[PDB]
Protein backbone atom coordinates (compact mmCIF):
# COMPACT_ATOMS: atom_id res chain seq x y z
CA UNK A 1 0.00 0.00 0.00
CA UNK A 2 1.08 3.59 -0.67
CA UNK A 3 2.13 5.63 2.35
CA UNK A 4 4.65 8.02 3.84
CA UNK A 5 7.38 5.40 3.28
CA UNK A 6 8.73 4.15 -0.05
CA UNK A 7 6.86 4.39 -3.37
CA UNK A 8 6.69 1.82 -6.16
CA UNK A 9 6.23 4.25 -9.12
CA UNK A 10 6.33 2.79 -12.63
CA UNK A 11 8.64 1.98 -15.54
CA UNK A 12 10.55 5.19 -16.38
CA UNK A 13 8.44 6.90 -13.70
CA UNK A 14 11.35 8.06 -11.57
CA UNK A 15 12.81 10.26 -14.33
CA UNK A 16 11.74 13.43 -12.53
CA UNK A 17 13.12 12.19 -9.21
CA UNK A 18 16.65 13.13 -8.20
CA UNK A 19 19.60 10.88 -9.04
CA UNK A 20 19.99 9.74 -5.42
CA UNK A 21 16.35 8.63 -5.26
CA UNK A 22 16.18 7.23 -8.81
CA UNK A 23 19.31 5.11 -8.31
CA UNK A 24 17.25 2.59 -6.29
CA UNK A 25 15.00 1.73 -9.28
CA UNK A 26 17.60 0.35 -11.70
CA UNK A 27 16.16 -3.19 -11.86
CA UNK A 28 12.69 -2.14 -13.13
CA UNK A 29 14.16 -0.43 -16.21
CA UNK A 30 16.73 -3.17 -16.86
CA UNK A 31 14.26 -6.07 -16.57
CA UNK A 32 11.94 -4.53 -19.21
CA UNK A 33 14.59 -4.32 -21.95
CA UNK A 34 13.52 -7.68 -23.44
CA UNK A 35 1.96 -11.20 -44.98
CA UNK A 36 5.67 -11.83 -45.46
CA UNK A 37 6.53 -8.11 -45.22
CA UNK A 38 5.07 -7.81 -41.69
CA UNK A 39 7.24 -10.73 -40.64
CA UNK A 40 10.32 -8.90 -41.93
CA UNK A 41 9.34 -5.75 -39.98
CA UNK A 42 8.71 -7.55 -36.67
CA UNK A 43 11.89 -9.64 -37.07
CA UNK A 44 13.92 -6.49 -37.78
CA UNK A 45 12.52 -4.83 -34.65
CA UNK A 46 13.28 -7.89 -32.49
CA UNK A 47 16.81 -8.24 -33.91
CA UNK A 48 17.50 -4.54 -33.30
CA UNK A 49 16.28 -4.80 -29.69
CA UNK A 50 18.47 -7.86 -29.10
CA UNK A 51 21.48 -6.18 -30.73
CA UNK A 52 21.02 -3.10 -28.52
CA UNK A 53 20.85 -5.21 -25.35
CA UNK A 54 23.86 -7.28 -26.46
CA UNK A 55 25.87 -4.12 -27.18
CA UNK A 56 25.08 -2.74 -23.71
CA UNK A 57 26.05 -6.04 -22.08
CA UNK A 58 29.24 -6.16 -24.18
CA UNK A 59 30.21 -2.67 -23.01
CA UNK A 60 29.64 -3.73 -19.41
CA UNK A 61 31.63 -6.92 -20.06
CA UNK A 62 34.69 -5.04 -21.36
CA UNK A 63 34.76 -3.17 -18.04
CA UNK A 64 35.02 -4.93 -14.70
CA UNK A 65 31.27 -4.65 -14.12
CA UNK A 66 29.99 -7.53 -16.26
CA UNK A 67 27.50 -8.82 -13.70
CA UNK A 68 26.29 -5.97 -11.50
CA UNK A 69 24.13 -2.89 -12.04
CA UNK A 70 26.15 -0.85 -9.52
CA UNK A 71 29.94 -1.14 -9.36
CA UNK A 72 33.05 0.94 -8.65
CA UNK A 73 36.08 1.94 -10.75
CA UNK A 74 39.69 3.08 -10.02
CA UNK A 75 39.81 6.06 -12.46
CA UNK A 76 38.79 9.31 -10.67
CA UNK A 77 36.59 12.12 -11.99
CA UNK A 78 38.42 15.08 -13.50
CA UNK A 79 36.91 18.40 -12.39
CA UNK A 80 36.99 19.75 -15.98
CA UNK A 81 34.05 17.47 -16.91
CA UNK A 82 31.54 18.86 -14.39
CA UNK A 83 33.27 21.14 -11.71
CA UNK A 84 30.23 20.92 -9.42
CA UNK A 85 29.78 19.67 -5.85
CA UNK A 86 28.71 16.11 -5.08
CA UNK A 87 25.63 16.98 -2.99
CA UNK A 88 24.19 19.31 -5.67
CA UNK A 89 24.21 16.42 -8.19
CA UNK A 90 22.50 13.60 -6.28
CA UNK A 91 20.13 15.84 -4.28
CA UNK A 92 19.36 18.66 -6.74
CA UNK A 93 19.61 17.17 -10.26
CA UNK A 94 17.87 14.57 -12.42
CA UNK A 95 19.29 11.96 -14.80
CA UNK A 96 18.06 13.78 -17.95
CA UNK A 97 20.00 16.94 -17.08
CA UNK A 98 23.14 15.16 -15.89
CA UNK A 99 23.08 13.04 -19.06
CA UNK A 100 22.69 16.12 -21.27
CA UNK A 101 25.57 17.88 -19.48
CA UNK A 102 28.04 14.96 -19.72
CA UNK A 103 26.91 13.88 -23.27
CA UNK A 104 29.94 15.59 -24.84
CA UNK A 105 32.42 13.81 -22.52
CA UNK A 106 30.95 10.28 -22.39
CA UNK A 107 33.30 8.84 -25.05
CA UNK A 108 36.42 9.98 -23.16
CA UNK A 109 35.15 8.41 -19.91
CA UNK A 110 34.37 5.18 -21.80
CA UNK A 111 37.89 5.02 -23.21
CA UNK A 112 39.41 5.72 -19.79
CA UNK A 113 37.31 2.94 -18.23
CA UNK A 114 38.34 0.42 -20.91
CA UNK A 115 42.05 1.33 -20.61
CA UNK A 116 41.90 1.16 -16.80
CA UNK A 117 40.31 -2.30 -16.93
CA UNK A 118 42.94 -3.54 -19.41
CA UNK A 119 45.77 -2.28 -17.20
CA UNK A 120 44.22 -3.75 -14.05
CA UNK A 121 43.70 -7.07 -15.87
CA UNK A 122 47.37 -7.35 -16.77
CA UNK A 123 48.54 -6.09 -13.35
CA UNK A 124 46.35 -8.66 -11.57
CA UNK A 125 47.52 -11.46 -13.87
CA UNK A 126 51.18 -10.53 -13.31
CA UNK A 127 50.65 -10.38 -9.53
CA UNK A 128 48.86 -13.75 -9.47
CA UNK A 129 51.65 -15.29 -11.60
CA UNK A 130 53.81 -15.60 -8.44
CA UNK A 131 51.62 -18.49 -7.22
CA UNK B 1 33.09 -47.33 -19.70
CA UNK B 2 30.03 -47.94 -17.53
CA UNK B 3 30.59 -49.19 -14.00
CA UNK B 4 29.41 -49.28 -10.40
CA UNK B 5 30.61 -45.71 -9.85
CA UNK B 6 29.38 -42.70 -11.81
CA UNK B 7 27.09 -42.74 -14.85
CA UNK B 8 27.05 -40.38 -17.82
CA UNK B 9 23.44 -40.64 -19.18
CA UNK B 10 22.36 -38.23 -21.91
CA UNK B 11 20.63 -34.90 -22.51
CA UNK B 12 17.57 -34.79 -20.18
CA UNK B 13 18.76 -38.21 -18.95
CA UNK B 14 18.29 -37.43 -15.25
CA UNK B 15 14.64 -36.37 -15.55
CA UNK B 16 13.53 -39.55 -13.78
CA UNK B 17 16.28 -39.43 -11.15
CA UNK B 18 16.20 -37.63 -7.82
CA UNK B 19 17.27 -33.98 -7.51
CA UNK B 20 20.46 -34.82 -5.60
CA UNK B 21 21.69 -37.18 -8.30
CA UNK B 22 20.37 -35.00 -11.16
CA UNK B 23 22.25 -31.95 -9.86
CA UNK B 24 25.54 -33.38 -11.18
CA UNK B 25 24.39 -33.15 -14.83
CA UNK B 26 23.60 -29.42 -14.91
CA UNK B 27 26.23 -28.75 -17.59
CA UNK B 28 24.83 -31.15 -20.22
CA UNK B 29 21.42 -29.43 -20.16
CA UNK B 30 22.90 -25.91 -20.26
CA UNK B 31 25.36 -26.57 -23.10
CA UNK B 32 22.54 -27.79 -25.40
CA UNK B 33 20.33 -24.68 -25.16
CA UNK B 34 22.06 -22.95 -28.07
CA UNK B 35 11.09 -20.25 -50.51
CA UNK B 36 11.00 -16.93 -48.67
CA UNK B 37 8.33 -18.06 -46.17
CA UNK B 38 10.47 -20.96 -44.91
CA UNK B 39 13.37 -18.56 -44.37
CA UNK B 40 11.06 -16.47 -42.18
CA UNK B 41 10.03 -19.58 -40.21
CA UNK B 42 13.64 -20.72 -39.65
CA UNK B 43 14.71 -17.21 -38.59
CA UNK B 44 11.70 -17.04 -36.25
CA UNK B 45 12.74 -20.30 -34.57
CA UNK B 46 16.36 -19.14 -34.16
CA UNK B 47 15.30 -15.70 -32.86
CA UNK B 48 12.89 -17.28 -30.35
CA UNK B 49 15.66 -19.59 -29.09
CA UNK B 50 17.96 -16.58 -28.66
CA UNK B 51 15.30 -14.53 -26.82
CA UNK B 52 14.60 -17.43 -24.44
CA UNK B 53 18.31 -17.88 -23.64
CA UNK B 54 18.77 -14.11 -23.20
CA UNK B 55 15.73 -13.92 -20.90
CA UNK B 56 17.11 -16.72 -18.70
CA UNK B 57 20.54 -15.05 -18.61
CA UNK B 58 18.91 -11.69 -17.79
CA UNK B 59 16.97 -13.23 -14.89
CA UNK B 60 20.20 -14.75 -13.59
CA UNK B 61 21.99 -11.42 -14.02
CA UNK B 62 19.44 -9.44 -12.00
CA UNK B 63 20.08 -11.80 -9.08
CA UNK B 64 23.43 -12.04 -7.30
CA UNK B 65 24.80 -14.68 -9.69
CA UNK B 66 26.52 -13.17 -12.75
CA UNK B 67 27.24 -16.57 -14.27
CA UNK B 68 27.59 -20.06 -12.74
CA UNK B 69 25.41 -23.18 -12.83
CA UNK B 70 25.00 -23.28 -9.02
CA UNK B 71 24.78 -20.26 -6.74
CA UNK B 72 23.55 -19.27 -3.29
CA UNK B 73 21.21 -16.46 -2.18
CA UNK B 74 20.88 -14.69 1.18
CA UNK B 75 17.18 -15.25 2.05
CA UNK B 76 15.76 -17.99 4.32
CA UNK B 77 13.25 -20.57 3.03
CA UNK B 78 9.55 -20.32 4.06
CA UNK B 79 7.85 -23.63 5.03
CA UNK B 80 4.56 -22.15 3.73
CA UNK B 81 5.83 -22.95 0.18
CA UNK B 82 6.76 -26.64 0.81
CA UNK B 83 7.43 -27.41 4.54
CA UNK B 84 8.89 -30.76 3.31
CA UNK B 85 12.04 -32.25 4.94
CA UNK B 86 15.47 -31.38 3.52
CA UNK B 87 16.78 -34.90 2.81
CA UNK B 88 13.33 -36.13 1.72
CA UNK B 89 13.33 -33.73 -1.25
CA UNK B 90 16.82 -34.31 -2.65
CA UNK B 91 16.88 -38.07 -1.97
CA UNK B 92 13.25 -39.05 -2.67
CA UNK B 93 11.83 -36.62 -5.26
CA UNK B 94 12.57 -35.83 -8.91
CA UNK B 95 12.80 -32.38 -10.50
CA UNK B 96 9.44 -32.61 -12.32
CA UNK B 97 7.40 -33.33 -9.17
CA UNK B 98 9.19 -30.60 -7.20
CA UNK B 99 8.63 -28.12 -10.04
CA UNK B 100 4.92 -29.00 -10.11
CA UNK B 101 4.70 -28.42 -6.35
CA UNK B 102 6.53 -25.05 -6.33
CA UNK B 103 4.89 -23.83 -9.61
CA UNK B 104 2.23 -21.86 -7.70
CA UNK B 105 4.90 -19.96 -5.68
CA UNK B 106 7.63 -19.16 -8.23
CA UNK B 107 6.73 -15.47 -8.81
CA UNK B 108 7.00 -14.70 -5.08
CA UNK B 109 10.49 -16.21 -4.79
CA UNK B 110 11.46 -14.43 -8.03
CA UNK B 111 10.42 -11.12 -6.51
CA UNK B 112 12.07 -11.76 -3.14
CA UNK B 113 15.41 -12.55 -4.82
CA UNK B 114 15.30 -9.25 -6.74
CA UNK B 115 14.45 -7.32 -3.55
CA UNK B 116 17.31 -8.92 -1.62
CA UNK B 117 19.75 -8.26 -4.46
CA UNK B 118 18.81 -4.57 -4.65
CA UNK B 119 19.17 -4.17 -0.87
CA UNK B 120 22.50 -6.05 -0.85
CA UNK B 121 23.83 -3.96 -3.75
CA UNK B 122 22.99 -0.63 -2.10
CA UNK B 123 24.36 -1.83 1.27
CA UNK B 124 27.60 -3.02 -0.37
CA UNK B 125 28.01 0.30 -2.20
CA UNK B 126 27.46 2.26 1.03
CA UNK B 127 29.88 -0.01 2.92
CA UNK B 128 32.57 0.37 0.25
CA UNK B 129 32.08 4.16 0.13
CA UNK B 130 33.65 4.74 3.59
CA UNK B 131 37.26 4.51 2.33
Amino acid at each position, epitope marked *: *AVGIG*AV*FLGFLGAAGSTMGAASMTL*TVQARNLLLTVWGIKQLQARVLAVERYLRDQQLLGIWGCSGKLICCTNVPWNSSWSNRNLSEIWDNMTWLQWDKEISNYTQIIYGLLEESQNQQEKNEQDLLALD | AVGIGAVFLGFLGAAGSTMGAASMTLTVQARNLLLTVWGIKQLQARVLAVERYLRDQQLLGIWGCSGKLICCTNVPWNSSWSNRNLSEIWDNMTWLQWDKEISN*YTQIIY*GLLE*ESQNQQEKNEQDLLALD
Partner: antibody
Amino acid sequence: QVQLQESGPGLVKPSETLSLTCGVSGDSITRNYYYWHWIRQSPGKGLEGLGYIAYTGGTDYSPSFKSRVTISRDTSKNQFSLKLTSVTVADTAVYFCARERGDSYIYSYDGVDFWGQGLLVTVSS
Amino acid sequence: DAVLTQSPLSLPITPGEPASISCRSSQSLLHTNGETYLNWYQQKTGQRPRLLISQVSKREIGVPDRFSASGAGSDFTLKISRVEAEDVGLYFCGQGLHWPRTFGQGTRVDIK
Protein backbone atom coordinates in the same frame (compact mmCIF):
# COMPACT_ATOMS: atom_id res chain seq x y z
CA GLN C 1 4.46 -17.43 12.25
CA VAL C 2 3.84 -13.81 13.23
CA GLN C 3 1.35 -13.29 16.08
CA LEU C 4 -0.33 -10.08 17.22
CA GLN C 5 -1.84 -9.50 20.66
CA GLU C 6 -3.38 -6.34 22.16
CA SER C 7 -3.30 -5.43 25.85
CA GLY C 8 -5.09 -2.92 28.05
CA PRO C 9 -8.19 -2.29 30.17
CA GLY C 10 -11.61 -3.35 28.90
CA LEU C 11 -13.56 -0.74 30.89
CA VAL C 12 -13.08 3.03 30.79
CA LYS C 13 -15.18 5.89 32.14
CA PRO C 14 -16.34 8.67 29.78
CA SER C 15 -14.43 11.87 28.85
CA GLU C 16 -10.75 11.01 29.51
CA THR C 17 -7.70 9.44 27.90
CA LEU C 18 -7.75 5.83 26.66
CA SER C 19 -4.60 3.81 26.04
CA LEU C 20 -4.09 0.43 24.38
CA THR C 21 -0.95 -1.56 23.59
CA CYS C 22 -0.41 -4.27 20.95
CA GLY C 23 2.60 -6.54 21.15
CA VAL C 24 4.41 -8.14 18.22
CA SER C 25 6.11 -11.55 18.20
CA GLY C 26 7.91 -13.50 15.50
CA ASP C 27 8.88 -10.39 13.53
CA SER C 28 10.58 -7.04 14.15
CA ILE C 29 8.68 -3.73 14.13
CA THR C 30 11.64 -2.20 12.24
CA ARG C 31 10.92 -4.29 9.11
CA ASN C 32 12.11 -2.74 5.83
CA TYR C 33 8.71 -2.31 4.10
CA TYR C 34 5.81 -2.94 6.50
CA TYR C 35 3.23 -0.74 8.26
CA TRP C 36 1.25 -1.25 11.48
CA HIS C 37 -2.40 -0.12 11.70
CA TRP C 38 -5.09 0.18 14.38
CA ILE C 39 -8.59 -0.65 13.12
CA ARG C 40 -11.79 -0.73 15.18
CA GLN C 41 -14.94 -2.68 14.30
CA SER C 42 -17.93 -0.69 15.48
CA PRO C 43 -21.35 -2.41 15.58
CA GLY C 44 -23.37 -1.45 12.50
CA LYS C 45 -21.25 1.50 11.36
CA GLY C 46 -18.47 -0.75 10.01
CA LEU C 47 -14.69 -0.75 10.21
CA GLU C 48 -12.72 2.43 10.94
CA GLY C 49 -8.98 3.06 10.69
CA LEU C 50 -7.67 5.09 13.62
CA GLY C 51 -4.16 5.51 12.22
CA TYR C 52 -0.87 3.79 11.52
CA ILE C 53 2.86 3.86 12.15
CA ALA C 54 5.47 3.45 9.43
CA TYR C 55 8.81 1.71 9.82
CA THR C 56 10.50 5.16 9.93
CA GLY C 57 8.57 6.32 13.02
CA GLY C 58 6.30 8.75 11.15
CA THR C 59 2.70 8.81 12.35
CA ASP C 60 -0.43 9.36 10.28
CA TYR C 61 -3.91 10.06 11.65
CA SER C 62 -7.25 10.15 9.86
CA PRO C 63 -8.79 13.64 9.37
CA SER C 64 -11.87 12.94 11.50
CA PHE C 65 -9.68 11.67 14.40
CA LYS C 66 -6.42 13.68 13.91
CA SER C 67 -7.34 15.82 16.95
CA ARG C 68 -7.98 12.78 19.18
CA VAL C 69 -5.72 9.83 18.19
CA THR C 70 -1.98 9.54 18.96
CA ILE C 71 0.37 6.62 18.25
CA SER C 72 3.80 5.94 19.77
CA ARG C 73 6.34 3.14 19.44
CA ASP C 74 9.06 1.51 21.56
CA THR C 75 11.55 -0.44 19.42
CA SER C 76 13.49 -1.70 22.49
CA LYS C 77 10.76 -4.23 23.36
CA ASN C 78 9.14 -4.69 19.88
CA GLN C 79 5.71 -3.18 20.55
CA PHE C 80 3.62 -0.10 19.80
CA SER C 81 0.82 1.68 21.64
CA LEU C 82 -2.04 4.07 20.88
CA LYS C 83 -3.40 6.91 23.02
CA LEU C 84 -6.95 8.23 22.56
CA THR C 85 -8.23 11.25 24.49
CA SER C 86 -11.78 12.64 24.87
CA VAL C 87 -13.50 9.27 24.65
CA THR C 88 -17.31 9.12 24.29
CA VAL C 89 -20.08 6.52 24.44
CA ALA C 90 -19.96 6.15 20.63
CA ASP C 91 -16.36 4.85 20.85
CA THR C 92 -17.50 1.46 22.26
CA ALA C 93 -16.12 -1.07 19.76
CA VAL C 94 -13.71 -3.96 19.29
CA TYR C 95 -10.21 -2.55 18.73
CA PHE C 96 -7.87 -4.55 16.48
CA CYS C 97 -4.18 -4.24 15.67
CA ALA C 98 -2.89 -5.47 12.32
CA ARG C 99 0.01 -5.35 9.85
CA GLU C 100 -0.44 -4.49 6.13
CA ARG C 101 2.04 -4.41 3.17
CA GLY C 102 4.21 -1.45 2.07
CA ASP C 103 4.91 -0.68 -1.63
CA SER C 104 8.67 -1.40 -2.00
CA TYR C 105 10.82 0.63 -4.42
CA ILE C 106 11.09 -2.32 -6.84
CA TYR C 107 7.64 -3.99 -6.55
CA SER C 108 4.18 -3.30 -5.15
CA TYR C 109 2.62 -5.34 -2.33
CA ASP C 110 -0.79 -4.70 -0.78
CA GLY C 111 -3.03 -6.43 1.76
CA VAL C 112 -3.16 -6.89 5.53
CA ASP C 113 -1.21 -10.04 6.37
CA PHE C 114 -2.15 -10.68 10.01
CA TRP C 115 -4.79 -9.49 12.48
CA GLY C 116 -4.91 -9.57 16.28
CA GLN C 117 -7.71 -10.96 18.43
CA GLY C 118 -9.73 -7.84 19.41
CA LEU C 119 -10.60 -6.29 22.78
CA LEU C 120 -13.99 -4.75 23.51
CA VAL C 121 -13.88 -1.49 25.50
CA THR C 122 -17.03 -0.27 27.27
CA VAL C 123 -17.40 3.50 27.76
CA SER C 124 -19.87 3.62 30.68
CA SER C 125 -19.82 3.97 34.45
CA ASP D 1 -13.22 10.28 0.98
CA ALA D 2 -13.33 7.12 -1.17
CA VAL D 3 -16.13 4.96 0.25
CA LEU D 4 -16.90 1.40 -0.83
CA THR D 5 -20.37 0.02 -1.55
CA GLN D 6 -21.25 -3.68 -1.71
CA SER D 7 -24.23 -5.44 -3.28
CA PRO D 8 -26.29 -7.55 -2.59
CA LEU D 9 -26.66 -6.81 1.14
CA SER D 10 -27.44 -10.47 1.90
CA LEU D 11 -26.59 -13.61 -0.08
CA PRO D 12 -28.74 -16.54 1.14
CA ILE D 13 -27.63 -19.67 -0.73
CA THR D 14 -27.52 -23.46 -0.36
CA PRO D 15 -24.60 -25.88 -0.80
CA GLY D 16 -24.72 -26.97 -4.45
CA GLU D 17 -24.75 -23.86 -6.65
CA PRO D 18 -22.15 -21.06 -7.12
CA ALA D 19 -22.15 -17.61 -5.51
CA SER D 20 -21.16 -14.07 -6.44
CA ILE D 21 -20.57 -10.77 -4.60
CA SER D 22 -19.94 -7.28 -6.01
CA CYS D 23 -18.07 -4.26 -4.64
CA ARG D 24 -17.75 -0.76 -6.11
CA SER D 25 -15.88 2.43 -5.23
CA SER D 26 -16.79 6.11 -5.50
CA GLN D 27 -13.34 7.09 -6.80
CA SER D 28 -11.06 5.37 -9.29
CA LEU D 29 -8.76 2.90 -7.55
CA LEU D 30 -6.29 2.74 -10.46
CA HIS D 31 -3.30 4.57 -8.96
CA THR D 32 -1.10 6.80 -11.13
CA ASN D 33 1.63 4.10 -11.20
CA GLY D 34 -0.73 1.70 -13.01
CA GLU D 35 -1.57 -0.65 -10.11
CA THR D 36 -4.90 -1.28 -8.39
CA TYR D 37 -5.01 -1.52 -4.57
CA LEU D 38 -8.21 -3.40 -3.69
CA ASN D 39 -8.29 -6.42 -1.37
CA TRP D 40 -10.94 -8.86 -0.14
CA TYR D 41 -11.41 -10.00 3.46
CA GLN D 42 -13.44 -12.70 5.20
CA GLN D 43 -14.50 -12.55 8.86
CA LYS D 44 -16.16 -15.28 10.91
CA THR D 45 -18.49 -14.87 13.89
CA GLY D 46 -16.32 -13.52 16.72
CA GLN D 47 -12.96 -14.04 14.98
CA ARG D 48 -10.24 -12.00 13.34
CA PRO D 49 -10.68 -11.25 9.62
CA ARG D 50 -8.65 -13.15 7.05
CA LEU D 51 -7.17 -11.81 3.81
CA LEU D 52 -8.41 -13.99 0.97
CA ILE D 53 -7.47 -12.26 -2.32
CA SER D 54 -4.99 -9.35 -2.79
CA GLN D 55 -4.19 -6.91 -5.66
CA VAL D 56 -7.73 -7.60 -7.06
CA SER D 57 -6.77 -11.09 -8.37
CA LYS D 58 -4.05 -12.77 -6.22
CA ARG D 59 -5.12 -15.87 -4.19
CA GLU D 60 -3.22 -15.39 -0.91
CA ILE D 61 -1.15 -18.36 0.25
CA GLY D 62 -3.07 -20.96 2.24
CA VAL D 63 -6.48 -19.89 0.90
CA PRO D 64 -8.64 -22.49 -0.95
CA ASP D 65 -8.69 -22.34 -4.75
CA ARG D 66 -12.53 -22.20 -4.61
CA PHE D 67 -12.33 -18.38 -4.32
CA SER D 68 -11.61 -16.01 -7.21
CA ALA D 69 -12.06 -12.36 -8.17
CA SER D 70 -11.62 -9.95 -11.07
CA GLY D 71 -12.12 -6.30 -11.90
CA ALA D 72 -10.57 -3.07 -13.15
CA GLY D 73 -11.03 0.67 -12.58
CA SER D 74 -14.20 0.94 -10.50
CA ASP D 75 -16.08 -2.38 -10.94
CA PHE D 76 -15.07 -5.53 -9.07
CA THR D 77 -16.75 -8.87 -8.39
CA LEU D 78 -16.03 -11.76 -6.02
CA LYS D 79 -17.16 -15.16 -7.30
CA ILE D 80 -16.97 -18.55 -5.58
CA SER D 81 -16.51 -21.46 -7.99
CA ARG D 82 -17.49 -24.03 -5.34
CA VAL D 83 -19.15 -23.03 -2.05
CA GLU D 84 -19.27 -25.28 1.05
CA ALA D 85 -21.03 -25.05 4.43
CA GLU D 86 -18.08 -23.43 6.27
CA ASP D 87 -18.23 -20.27 4.12
CA VAL D 88 -20.76 -18.62 6.46
CA GLY D 89 -19.75 -15.15 7.59
CA LEU D 90 -19.14 -11.58 6.49
CA TYR D 91 -17.11 -10.46 3.47
CA PHE D 92 -15.29 -7.12 3.39
CA CYS D 93 -13.72 -5.26 0.46
CA GLY D 94 -11.18 -2.55 1.21
CA GLN D 95 -8.82 -0.20 -0.57
CA GLY D 96 -5.29 0.62 0.54
CA LEU D 97 -4.79 3.53 -1.85
CA HIS D 98 -6.60 6.59 -0.51
CA TRP D 99 -6.25 8.04 2.99
CA PRO D 100 -8.07 7.32 5.33
CA ARG D 101 -8.41 3.60 4.58
CA THR D 102 -12.00 2.45 4.08
CA PHE D 103 -13.86 -0.87 4.09
CA GLY D 104 -17.29 -1.92 2.87
CA GLN D 105 -20.36 -2.14 5.09
CA GLY D 106 -20.10 -5.94 5.10
CA THR D 107 -22.36 -8.46 3.37
CA ARG D 108 -23.17 -11.60 5.36
CA VAL D 109 -23.62 -15.04 3.78
CA ASP D 110 -25.87 -17.62 5.41
CA ILE D 111 -27.56 -20.90 4.52
CA LYS D 112 -31.06 -20.48 3.06
